[PDB]
Amino acid sequence: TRFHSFSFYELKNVTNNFDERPISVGGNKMGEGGFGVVYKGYVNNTTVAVKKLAAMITTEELKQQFDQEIKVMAKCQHENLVELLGFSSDGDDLCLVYVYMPNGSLLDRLSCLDGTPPLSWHMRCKIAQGAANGINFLHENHHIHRDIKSANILLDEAFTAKISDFGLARASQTVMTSRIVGTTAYMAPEALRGEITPKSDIYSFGVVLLEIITGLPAVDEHREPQLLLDIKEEIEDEEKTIEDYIDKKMNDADSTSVEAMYSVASQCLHEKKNKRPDIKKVQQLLQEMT
Template structure:
């Protein structure tokens, strides 16, 4: 006889009922397995015990649902399928089924490659179309010849895969999977299939397009980047290269942090290395002894550049601001303090930026004529509010 268990909401659930292994609750019912076989086949993966945000009961975190909209909101299988809503979580939020399994391997032949989007030290990015998913994606291609740099290139790629597999957040670039193959000439090719960001990098948006961003839109971008950085730091990781080139922007002006190839775990036993974009690096970077406060420093420079559209100076490893931002001068100054201990933490930055945005939104609601105002006047309202509050 099958055993029965009470769910958090009092409904009876058969222990051998079939369950669905899906990315989100709206996907087709694929990969059907019984609950017993599901746990039996994956019991060796069960390592840590976590508490469900729905029923507040412990569950094994090898498989769980995580909300893409809420910060660190996780549900056990039962609560997710009961559509449990607590706190700020609502039923229309997208839920992802996560596990300790590696990132999906994608058949490269399923993708139709298009134009080149850009290139960096370890690869070239292309725009591509994924017909079976009816999805436009970006593909980062790394070709690894067999030479003295083979290990370095491969290590960079798989570090990026590992970093993205741990981080799911609305402000961190989404990764769908990767592929790898051996080419005829003996070289190896690795492809990381990523979310396509219509507006490109923040650097391109600031300097290579004719579009003029309002201060309010820039504030929204700043909040997004700070939120993504906080998520990285919450996972005890350091990005090590937060700058306009590595911030991607969607059509709706949502900003996401990308290029996790040089991110590293804080508790790694490996020594810290001198990796990153030199013009944005603080003094401690050159010693190889640094922590998450390095990201705070590069974020501060990025924040100033976002609001001024002018880069800073870097001469003899000393950084100086070329033009003062009209807003958040105090926050920027704190972020780029030479003493890492005096820089704020990511959570503090998120709170301060969000408080200012909330205050601005309230002011806008009280200003009935706001929609009809010129962009210059709207910008001035934001600047005046900053002068009064100094957030």
């Protein structure tokens, strides 16, 4: 509940003065998003993940997300969610300290970033389950994630799914905003129009399920089709099948359970929010799959 307050200068030292070069070329950079850069850190015998908030066009605004990340982190602690260890305010330089995830993000593991071997269909089902449980806990606690994507599903040594990035998270199937925030490749139709509903989180999870099946990122500029959702259309319009897209980097994948995960994904991806299943139903269908 109550978080440790680190001083900016402690964090600078622990991250080799926020060395922005990738860990692959001897830097501290593990990844980046639109609102910040994540660094590897070594605080008091603990390897940590330091997210330093930054405009990658946002104002501050940034501080609103900082207060929101801590507020949700204080109330939401669970087996399938990341754990915040601390924070740093000092001027415009805002940092959040997390538990270091040895298997990084689902997005990076599906693309085998840095020579990691491809994920077994067995681990993929475990991840899908864990990721769904984390969303259930957030919803049961009247919270909408708003940024469900494979980059925001982190993995430990045992490949346990851990939902991250709560900077956009909101306490709660029809609320309204103005100013649309999130990742468009994953965003539900209603979400792109201002609607704040837990049903949007489910849609996004369907996009994640297709990435899990195919090993393909939601959007790829140098791919035909660019969008993974266009391949969902091709399946539903008999122009192609799910087998034509099952990740070729698997051997333990059986069309039986693969078609089952696709069935769940298809329901998650219903155009009309009320036709989509709730998180508890998604959980049921995934536990039924194995």
